[PDB]
Paper text:
Thus, to deduce the molecular mechanism underlying DNA binding and recognition by BldC, we determined the structure of S. coelicolor BldC bound to a 22 bp double-stranded DNA based on the optimized whiI binding site (whiI opt). The structure was solved by single wavelength anomalous diffraction (SAD) using data collected from a selenomethionine-substituted BldC(L43M-L58M)-whiI opt DNA crystal (WT BldC-whiI opt produced the same crystals) and refined to Rwork/Rfree values of 22.3%/26.8% to 3.28 Å resolution. Notably, the structure reveals that BldC forms a head to tail (head-tail) dimer on the DNA whereby each BldC protomer binds to a 9 bp direct repeat with the recognition helix of the HTH motif interacting in the major groove and the wing in the minor groove. Formation of the head-tail BldC dimer buries ~600 Å2 of protein surface from solvent. The oligomer interface is largely hydrophobic with residues Phe21, Val23, and Trp31 packing against the side chains of Leu11′, Ile 40′, Thr42′, Leu43′, and Gly44′ (where ′ indicates the other subunit of the DNA-stabilized dimer). Hydrogen bonds/electrostatic contacts between the side chains of Arg22 and Glu16′ help fasten the two subunits together. The head-tail binding of the two BldC protomers bends the whiI site by ~50°. However, the minor and major groove widths are significantly distorted: the wing-bound, AT-rich minor groove has an average width of 9.3 Å (compared to 12.0 Å for B-DNA) whereas the minor groove outside this region is widened significantly (14.5 Å). However, despite the low resolution, the electron density for the Arg30 side chain is clear and reveals that it provides highly specific, bidentate hydrogen bonds to Gua2′ and Gua11′. Thus, the analysis of the BldC-whiI opt structure indicates that there are two main DNA elements specifically recognized by BldC; an AT-rich region and a C-G, 4 base pairs downstream from the AT-rich region, which is recognized by Arg30.
Like BldD and BldO, BldC acts as a repressor to sustain vegetative growth, and so deletion of bldC causes the premature onset of sporulation. bldC encodes a 68-residue protein that is predicted to contain a winged helix-turn-helix (wHTH) motif, suggesting it may be involved in DNA binding. While BldC appears to contain a MerR-like wHTH, it is to date, the only known MerR-like protein that consists entirely of a wHTH with no obvious effector or oligomerization domain. Using a battery of structural, biochemical, and in vivo approaches, we show here that BldC functions as a pleotropic regulator of Streptomyces development by employing a unique mode of DNA binding for a transcription factor that involves asymmetric head-to-tail oligomerization on DNA direct repeats of varying number with concomitant distortion of the DNA.
Numbering used by the authors:
A (entry chain B): 10 to 60
B (entry chain A): 9 to 60
The structure:
Amino acid sequence: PLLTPAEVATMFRVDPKTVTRWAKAGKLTSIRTMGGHRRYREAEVRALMAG
Amino acid sequence: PPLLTPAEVATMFRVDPKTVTRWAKAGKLTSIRTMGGHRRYREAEVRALMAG
DNA sequence: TTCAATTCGGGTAATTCGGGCA
DNA sequence: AATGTCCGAATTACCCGAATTG
């Protein structure tokens, strides 16, 4: 399963650009759409509620 | 060779099937057409894009 | 043959990117 | 470092009816 940047934005209650920024700095593995959009592996996103 | 319907591609990218059709229509993706003109894409190449 | 599910097309909203600024 | 916001441009998502699928 994959999640959109908006969804990941909602779960932490943070702006989706900040999700984009957690993708920047390495602590979120991001798969990219061939238009260059982010899709985040939802397992890692569990690891972030584990943290 | 194994073939994928645009709904399955759509699923693996978490992306609306229309957008996969756009990707085909814009050269980014190799498309095969059935006798009616529906697209079918090539599995192998599609994870050649998970390689990228 | 019929039948549910999908995938055509086009059009139009809604996200997302990216960079730069606060 | 670490978010939040404004902008423009690009990408993607939902809407429809009709055609194709298997």
